[PDB]
Write a protein that binds this ligand. Structure first.
Ligand SMILES: CC(=O)N[C@H]1[C@@H](OP(=O)(O)OP(=O)(O)OC[C@H]2O[C@@H](n3ccc(=O)[nH]c3=O)[C@H](O)[C@@H]2O)O[C@H](CO)[C@@H](O)[C@@H]1O
Length: 419
């Protein structure tokens, strides 16, 4: 089991080029199942999740290749089942379901359990699919979908905001008969990205980015070329990296507009931030961050995907900070890890009360999920001494070359083996 050996403290400064959004490349890769014609998805990050996705696609009968871009040929998709062995490591696997039934009249996906930040119920996916006319069956640890003829447009009122379900529903609706309305749709930039991708294929979608998405189904989707938007969470992660280390950083290939809340939060922490068309600069001026209050919520609010990072920020900030996680139920795994590093925090249900300390101490800590893993590595960067982050495979799933990137920023980091 690989681990990150990190030597701190090290001020994180310099530049980083933001990779394509894992969160947009994923739903787009899946949406590509809808494409009858060649598809080119550009700016796709090199992540384990992308590999897993590519493998899954291939299993379905998709022709897939990659470098920067991922080339997809789903003309011959002829296998409508995503087996446990292929979906097991990735919650996003559910995305194969919608495209499959929407295009093929049938699909089945083994239910992945998802990472420990919280359960992965897919009731909203099923809900929307059912609304679209699909018959859903939960059997054999599988979610089975079918429909006679085409899916049918429907007015789908989402009682909960779901990034994943919004993608499934939006995607599936592009092939439905008639118009679909997704009320209370997730607004995430990844939804906009996926919607734009769909449109590039011939889909009729509007309202993406707003709480109301309108899809006018079409008989079939063609092909196209689409560039995945920058990874806002990667961007936020690097920003925080500088923000907690008294550093200065410039994020290249960034999309400032996808980070309003995070940037404002960083400003609250005292960061000197500037933004350009495709870049974001953060300058701490050697300053310690100021503690902040964070309430995660659906886009455009503060992203739960920045939660662990901000917890860290608070933990080394000046003052008492409060972080409320409203999206996931088990997303405080990083807290004990950080406390082992000398952090001071109390958890009250979905809120973590942070008491920033001047300095962390290197420790043996364990990555439990994507964001937390990255958080721990950052903590190792600024902590005094040696930090060993175990199970970095977590980070490999969703970060492209974080090791290289961190190194380029001055981090003393090493990937080691040994369970
Ligand atoms: C691959 C990808 O893009 N992952 C992101 C996506 O995941 P994900 O799509 O899983 O996020 P959701 O928005 O759907 O989940 C939000 C909340 O809704 C619940 N829920 C979701 C679906 C459903 O059918 N029923 C249900 O109860 C969840 O378990 C959680 O408690 O959005 C999250 C919220 O910004 C991010 O943190 C994840 O990194």
């Amino acid at each position: 089991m690989d681990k990150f050996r990190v030597q701190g403290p090290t001020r994180l400064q310099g530049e980083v080029t933001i990779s394509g959004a894992k969160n947009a490349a994923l739903p787009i890769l899946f949406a590509a199942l809808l494409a009858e014609e060649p598809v080119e998805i550009q700016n796709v990050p090199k992540l384990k999740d992308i590999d897993t996705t590519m493998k899954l696609l291939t299993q379905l009968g998709t022709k897939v290749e990659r470098x920067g871009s991922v080339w997809i040929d789903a003309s011959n998709v002829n296998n409508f089942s995503a087996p446990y062995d292929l979906v097991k490591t990735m919650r996003a696997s559910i995305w194969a379901l919608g495209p499959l039934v929407a295009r093929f009249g049938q699909g089945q996906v083994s239910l992945p359990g998802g990472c420990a930040i919280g359960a992965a119920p897919v009731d909203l996916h099923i809900f929307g699919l059912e609304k679209l006319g699909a018959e859903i069956k939960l059997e054999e640890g599988y979610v089975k979908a079918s429909v006679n003829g085409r899916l049918k447009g429907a007015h789908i009122v989402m009682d909960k905001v779901s990034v994943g379900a919004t993608v499934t529903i939006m995607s599936a609706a592009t092939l439905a008969e008639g118009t679909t309305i997704i009320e209370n749709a997730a607004r995430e930039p990844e939804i906009v990205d996926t919607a734009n991708f769909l449109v590039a294929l011939g889909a009729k979608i509007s309202g993406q980015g707003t709480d109301r998405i309108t899809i006018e189904g079409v008989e079939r989707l063609g092909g196209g070329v689409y560039r995945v938007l920058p990874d806002r969470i990667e961007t936020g992660t690097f920003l925080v990296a500088a923000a907690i280390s008294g550093g200065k950083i410039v994020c290249r290939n960034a999309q400032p507009d996808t980070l309003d809340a995070v940037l404002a939060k960083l400003r609250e922490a005292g960061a000197d931030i500037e933004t350009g068309e495709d870049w974001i600069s953060l300058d701490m001026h050697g300053k310690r961050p100021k503690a902040v209050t964070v309430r995660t919520a659906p886009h455009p609010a503060f992203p739960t995907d920045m939660q662990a990072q901000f917890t860290l920020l608070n933990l080394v900030a000046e003052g008492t900070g409060v972080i409320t996680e409203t999206i996931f139920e088990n997303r405080f795994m990083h807290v004990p890890e950080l406390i082992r590093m000398g952090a001071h925090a109390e958890i009250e249900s979905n809120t973590v009360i942070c008491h920033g300390v001047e300095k962390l101490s290197g420790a043996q800590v364990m990555a439990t999920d994507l964001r937390a893993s990255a958080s721990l590595v950052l903590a190792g960067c600024i902590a005094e001494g040696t930090t060993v982050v175990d199970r970095i495979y977590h980070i490999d799933r969703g970060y492209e070359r974080i090791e290289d990137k961190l190194r380029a920023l001055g981090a003393n980091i090493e990937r080691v083996k040994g369970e």
